[PDB]
Every structure is written in structure tokens, then in C-alpha cells.
Design a protein around this ligand. Sequence first.
Ligand SMILES: [Zn+2]
Length: 480
Amino acid sequence: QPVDTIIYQAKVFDGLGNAPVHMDVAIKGQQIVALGELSAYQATEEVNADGLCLAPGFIDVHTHDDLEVLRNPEMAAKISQGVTTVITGNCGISAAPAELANDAPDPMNLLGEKAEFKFAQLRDYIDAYKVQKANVNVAALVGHTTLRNNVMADLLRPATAAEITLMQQQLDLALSQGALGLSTGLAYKNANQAPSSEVHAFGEVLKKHDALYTTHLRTEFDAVLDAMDEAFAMEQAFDIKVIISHLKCAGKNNWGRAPELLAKFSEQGEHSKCSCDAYPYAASSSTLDLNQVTDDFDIFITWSDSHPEMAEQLLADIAKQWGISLLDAAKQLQPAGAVYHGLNEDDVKTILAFDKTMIGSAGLPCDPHPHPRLWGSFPRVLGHYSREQGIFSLATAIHKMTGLSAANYRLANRGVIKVGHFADLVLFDADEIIDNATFVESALPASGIHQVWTNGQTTFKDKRVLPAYSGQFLTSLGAS
Ligand SMILES: [Zn+2]
């Protein structure tokens, strides 16, 4: 008869892109149990949401939070944005299944330090998550580069057919233990010599488990359209779900080409199910890479192990202080992290507006001065691009971080405000929600989020991140 909580009089967005409905929402246990006008229900707690909006909890489909959720189960960077679920294991790197010999090969340092990789099997990682759980749900992909490192000591080559056989078996076991699918990061030096046929060797395993394929493209610069062909070939050959990560046309050469990327989806063939995600910024962030050094746009160093006095400075200013070229300064700064202001804002708007595009933060949790997407992506979409810029409605914006993402990743009973679905929810003020993180002050929490529930338990309330630790590990459904 009774319920734990009723949220009264909010503008409720279902997560499916439909117009909001003014109504009340009842939570009991982990579940949404009633929707409508509910003053006839007995609730332990009552939340007055008059003038506020209620949406499904946001799903961050592009994270490198594999080890961050173990180090930092409160997950304030995500929870303070309204994110209740993270997809881990992106761009070819995952915490599991991974056995390291001497070091963690690049880019696995984006996840954590080599000693943190303690999960020879995915089941080991799930056990570790279940020790404390976390404020976010976790669903995990397996990284192709991580699989390569398990069986190859020299990564600067194709894997042998025998090494491919081992990787197929390791993925098959990870999928059976609960992984969602496989990710690749083919632009990175330690995967770039994998030919398309090496990636294709995983297709039968993925198809057998009805699993996902996600990809950081082999290049996102001049030849990005060719790189997209590679991703479509997985869909064509195996009829599996493919997601292109952080879609962009990078480089001054390619500013204005976003329509070409949208039109490229017409080349998929018989199946038309490829999706993509993007973060809402015109600046990327990664290790300082000599191939990306240019004078075409600002490049900011975020950290440098060689010259920590140069952290948070513009590469052009560093070069001038040092009396050498941008490229020579970059060589001396390595290893380092950078933010590259190399995207065009109109391209970003077009990619965000594309109806296939989900919102993903691509936040780098080990960065000591992170790109502000780590703390602002989702309220930036709702407050900057929807309310202020008007490029889409609030219903559309919410859909692209909730119901669209749960559907594309097959997240059962999430992403939608519907009776019987999990009570992952965000209460916010539609007129005040906004990102506050800037490139200079990159960890400022967003405004406008009043309360967050993860599986029916409050993980954020009135600026407090709360250790409910009610997240669950979301094991894959496998085949029929
Ligand atoms: Zn990536």
C-alpha cells in the first residue's frame, strides 16, 4: 500500500522525447511504482517539485571511469551532473580482463596506475565493484587494446592469427561474465597496426552474444569518412549494434564538414542501426601528441611530468618562453596532457543536433586539470545548447542522455520514467541548470540540480553528494 517517496507536481519527462507531463511520481524500493496525481498514496517522504522538472537519470555512454568507480564510489563529477549510469571500457581500453607484465601501455594510463589493474577476468572486476558498489550503475565494455596487451609483448604490429584466437576466447569469456561488447581505439599507436581483419575476427563472438561494438575511429582528421567505412563494415558483416564514439571532424582542414559526417550514415548498407555519441565542446583532450601539434588553434597543457611548471599554460606561450618551436616544446613536455581547441562550434552543434547522437562526457578522471566536460557535459547540453542556444527542446536533450542511450546499450528498465522501471531520477530547475566548469576552473560543479536518485536511493541532494552507493553492475543480457 505505502511508498517510500512521492515527488509532487514536477514537469516529468519520460525520456522518450515526448512532451513533459505535470504529475506526481512514486518510488518504492528500487522502482518507480506509480505515476499520476497521487495525493491518495501514503508516502514516507514527500518532495515538493513545483516549478521543477523530473527526468530519468542521465546515462554517460562514454567514460573512462573503469577504475575511478572503484577508487571514488561517490563519483561526484558524474553525480553532480545528474548522471546515474556510466558505460566503461571505451576506446579500446578496459580495466578487465587485463594482466599487465611490466607497465600499462598507452592509453591505459587514462584509467589509472598499473598497480590498480588487478582483474585478470571481468568477474574479478565485478567482485571488486560489489565490495562497495558506487553511486552510479556500471556497464562495461572490453577494450581491444587491453586484449592485445594480454597476448602481445610487442604491440607495434598486427596480432598473429594465434594471438587473435586467444583474444576471441578472452572476449567470449568476458561477454559471458557480463560485458556489453567490445571497444576499439584504432588511432592509438598500440592498436593502429591492427588491420580491419583483426577487428573483424571478433564479429562472430559479438554476434553470438548479441553484443555491442563501439569504436574510437582510426582517424578523426582528413580521412575520417574512410575511417567510418571501417565501423560500418562491422555492422554489415555481423548485423551487430555499432556505436561511433565522440563523433567529430577535427583539424582546421575539416571545419565545416559535419554535414558530410551525417550524410556518411547513408552508406551503411542493408542495416541502418549505427549510432554515435558526442561531448558538447569544441575542444578535445588527450595526451600531448606530436602529431596533433599545430599553430592553427590554441593548445593548453594540463599536466607535464617533464616540466610541471608548465602545467595549465598555452603551448604557444611555453614555446616563446623557451625560445623553440611549438613542436620542439611539445617534445620536451612529453609525457603530458593537453586540451586542443581544434573543433568548430557549428560542427559540434550539427553533430549534437543529429538524432542518432547520444551525449557522452569523455571525461578523463586521472587528469589533474581535466577538460571541463568531466564536470559539465550533461548540464551544458540542457542549459547551454537547449535553453540558451535553442538548438533542441528540453525533451529532445533529455532523450539523448536517457531513453536513446538505454535503448542503444540495451539497459533493461532504465532511461525511462515508466511504472516498473528503476528509480534512477534527476530533479532539476530547467531555467537555472547550467554547467559551471570552464577551461580554467574545470571542476566547478553544475548549477540547477536539486536531487538525484540511483535505484531509488538519494545520491545527491542540495549540493551534497551522498554515499548511498546504490548503483548496480549492469550485466549484459546475452543472446535470446
Ligand atoms: Zn576515444
